[PDB]
C-alpha cells in the first residue's frame, strides 16, 4: 500500500543524462544570484539549482546570467552548480486541477498526491486579438441583489472589485462562487463556470478557513485554489497570478466558460515592488516600479470572452483591490481602474454602518455589464439604479422639510436600501432575486413598514412558492417577463402584500 506506492516511486528514479547544465553561483543574496556560464540559455528559462530550488533567468548579460531565485535564499549559496531545466517557465494545466488546492509550483498542498494535468503551458501568454473576442452575452450571477441588478456582471469581463481591507473582502467573491454552485453543478456546460480562486498574500491559516468553508459548501469540486501565502516568497508571489491565469486559459481554450478571481492584486504590486527594488531597477510613483502598469495590464487582458472560432470560451476576471484608506486616486488603484471594465467599489463607511454587503452605487460602474443581463433582470430592474440615485440625491439634501414627492422617494429609498442587504456567506438564488426586485420596483414595498422588510422578503418568497411556484418556474425558463407574467406577478405580489 504505502509500501507499494513508495516502491513504485523508488523504481521511478533511474539514471541522469548528460546535457548542458552547470553554471556556478558567485554573488548571491538579495534574492538574485549571478551565475557563471549557462552559455546557451533560453530567455526566461526555469533553472533548477543544485540547492534544490528553481529560479527564472532574468538578465542574460555578456558573460554572466542573473537568475532570480523563485524560492528561499537560505539553501542557495556561493559556488553551487546551477543546472538548466532547459525550458521556459511552464506550469501544468489540465482538467484534473479541479478541486485541488495547489501552491505556485503546482505542488499539491491539498496533498492529494500528484495532480492530473493535460499539459503544461508557459506562464506568460499573450492575450487574444480583436478578431478572437465576441461581445458578452451570458451573465454571471452572484446571487446577491444589486450585485447583479445595480451592478450587472457578465462573462469574460474584467470586472473590478475594489474596496478596503478585511471588510470581509473575500466574502463578496465567495458568495459569487456559491451562487454559481447551482449552475456549475448543472448539466449544461454552457452553464458551467470553472472558477479559480487565487489566494495571494493571505495567511495560510486564513486560506485554511477558506478551504474549509468551500469544502463545507461542497464547492471544492468545481473550483481550484492556487495559494501563494504571505509567508511564501515574493518572486513566487510575483509569478502567482500569471500561473493561475494559464490554468484558467486551458478551460477557456476548451471553449468552456470559466471565471478567475484574483485576490488580491494589490499584494502582487507590493511583491513586484519588492522584486524590482531587489533588482535595483528605479522606483516609480509611490515607489511602485514603472513596469507595474505593464505587469497588471498584461495579466488582466488575458481574461476575455472569445469568439465562436475559439469556441466562445470565457475567463471572467474579478480582481480584488485593497485600497489603503479608500485612496481612490492612489497610483495602484487608478492604474487598475483604467484597465478594468467597471468598478465595484464597496462602501466601507456603510459596511461599518450595518449595510452588509455595502456597495457604493456611485462608485460602482460596469462598462459593458448591462447587455449581459437577462431580460427579466433588465425589465424588473429597469430604472432602479436611477431611482436609488434619486434616493442618493434625496438623502443628499434631506439633511429640513420634505415635500411629499421627496418624502415618497425617501420612504421608498430607505426601504429599498434595506432590501438590498444580504446575510454574509449565504447568497440567494437568481430566480428569487427576480420577484424581490419586482416588488419594490412595482411599488409593492412602498407601503411595507420598515421593521418588517426582512419578514416581507422571506414570507414573500415562501408565499410565491406555496401559492404558485409555477410562476417562478416559468420565469426560470423563459428568463423574460411576459406581459401575462408581469400582470400575474403584479396580482400575486399584491396578494402577498395583503398578507
Amino acid at each position: 500500500e504505502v509500501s507499494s506506492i513508495l516502491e513504485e516511486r523508488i523504481k521511478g528514479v533511474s539514471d541522469e543524462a548528460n546535457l548542458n547544465e552547470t553554471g556556478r553561483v558567485l554573488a548571491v543574496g538579495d534574492g538574485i544570484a549571478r551565475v557563471f556560464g549557462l552559455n546557451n540559455i533560453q530567455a526566461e528559462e526555469l533553472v533548477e539549482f543544485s540547492s534544490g530550488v528553481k529560479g527564472m533567468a532574468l538578465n542574460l548579460e555578456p558573460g554572466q546570467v542573473g537568475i532570480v531565485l523563485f524560492g528561499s535564499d537560505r539553501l542557495v549559496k556561493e559556488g553551487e552548480l546551477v543546472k538548466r531545466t532547459g525550458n521556459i517557465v511552464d506550469v501544468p494545466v489540465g482538467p484534473g486541477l479541479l478541486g485541488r488546492v495547489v501552491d505556485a509550483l503546482g505542488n499539491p498542498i491539498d496533498g492529494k498526491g500528484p495532480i492530473d494535468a493535460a499539459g503544461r503551458s508557459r506562464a506568460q501568454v499573450k492575450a487574444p486579438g480583436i478578431l478572437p473576442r465576441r461581445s458578452v452575452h451570458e451573465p454571471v450571477q452572484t446571487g446577491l441583489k444589486a450585485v447583479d441588478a445595480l451592478v450587472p456582471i457578465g462573462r469574460g469581463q474584467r470586472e473590478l472589485i475594489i474596496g478596503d481591507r478585511q471588510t470581509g473582502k473575500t466574502a463578496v467573491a465567495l458568495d459569487t462562487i456559491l451562487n454559481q454552485k447551482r449552475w456549475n453543478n448543472g448539466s449544461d456546460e454552457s452553464k458551467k463556470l470553472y472558477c479559480v480562486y487565487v489566494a495571494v498574500g493571505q495567511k495560510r491559516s486564513t486560506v485554511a478557513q477558506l478551504v474549509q468553508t468551500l469544502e463545507q459548501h461542497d464547492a471544492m469540486k468545481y473550483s481550484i485554489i492556487v495559494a501563494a501565502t504571505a509567508s511564501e516568497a515574493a518572486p513566487l508571489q510575483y509569478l502567482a497570478p500569471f500561473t493561475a491565469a494559464s490554468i484558467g486559459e486551458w478551460f477557456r481554450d476548451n471553449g468552456k466558460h470559466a471565471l478567475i478571481v484574483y485576490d488580491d492584486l494589490s499584494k502582487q504590486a507590493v511583491a513586484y515592488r519588492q522584486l524590482s527594488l531587489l533588482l535595483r531597477r528605479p522606483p516609480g510613483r509611490e515607489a511602485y516600479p514603472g513596469d507595474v502598469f505593464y505587469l497588471h495590464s498584461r495579466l488582466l487582458e488575458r481574461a476575455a470572452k472569445l469568439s465562436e472560432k475559439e469556441g466562445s470560451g470565457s475567463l471572467t476576471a474579478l480582481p480584488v483591490i485593497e485600497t489603503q484608506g479608500g485612496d481612490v486616486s492612489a497610483y495602484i488603484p487608478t492604474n487598475v481602474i483604467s484597465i478594468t471594465d467597471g468598478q465595484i467599489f464597496l462602501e466601507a463607511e456603510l459596511f461599518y454602518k450595518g449595510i452588509r454587503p455595502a456597495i457604493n452605487v456611485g462608485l460602482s460602474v460596469s462598462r459593458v455589464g448591462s447587455a449581459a443581463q437577462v431580460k427579466a433582470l433588465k425589465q424588473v430592474a429597469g430604472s432602479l439604479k436611477l431611482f436609488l440615485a434619486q434616493y442618493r440625491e434625496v438623502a443628499a439634501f434631506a439633511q429640513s422639510d420634505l415635500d411629499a414627492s421627496t418624502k415618497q422617494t425617501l420612504v421608498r429609498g430607505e426601504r429599498l436600501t434595506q432590501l438590498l442587504k444580504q446575510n454574509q456567506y449565504s447568497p440567494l438564488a437568481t430566480e428569487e432575486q427576480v420577484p424581490l426586485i419586482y416588488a419594490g420596483v412595482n411599488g409593492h414595498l412602498d407601503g411595507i413598514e420598515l421593521s418588517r422588510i426582512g419578514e416581507f422578503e422571506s414570507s414573500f418568497l415562501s408565499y410565491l412558492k406555496s401559492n404558485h411556484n409555477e410562476l417562478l418556474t416559468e420565469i426560470r425558463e423563459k428568463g423574460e417577463l411576459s406581459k401575462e407574467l408581469l400582470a400575474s406577478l403584479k396580482s400575486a405580489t399584491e396578494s402577498f402584500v395583503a398578507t
Binding site: 415562501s462 412558492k465 406555496s466 401559492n467 404558485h468 409555477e470 396578494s495 395583503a498 398578507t499
Partner: protein, 56 residues
C-alpha cells in the same frame, strides 16, 4: 394540490377581512402554513436515503 388549499385560503383571508371574526382564524392559518412550509423545506431538504457504498 397544496396551491389549491392556499388559493382558497388567501381568498378567504381577504374575505374574512370583510366579515367579523379573526380572533383564532390567523392562528389556524399560521399553523397550516407553518407545517406546509416546513414540509416544503423538508421536501427540498431531502437527499437520497442510502449510503453510497459504491465509492465509499
Amino acid at each position: 394540490a397544496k396551491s389549491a388549499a392556499n388559493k382558497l385560503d388567501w381568498a378567504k383571508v381577504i374575505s374574512s377581512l370583510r366579515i367579523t371574526g379573526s380572533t383564532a382564524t390567523q392562528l389556524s392559518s399560521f399553523k397550516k402554513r407553518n407545517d406546509e412550509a416546513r414540509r416544503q423545506l423538508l421536501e427540498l431538504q431531502s437527499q437520497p436515503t442510502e449510503v453510497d457504498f459504491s465509492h465509499y
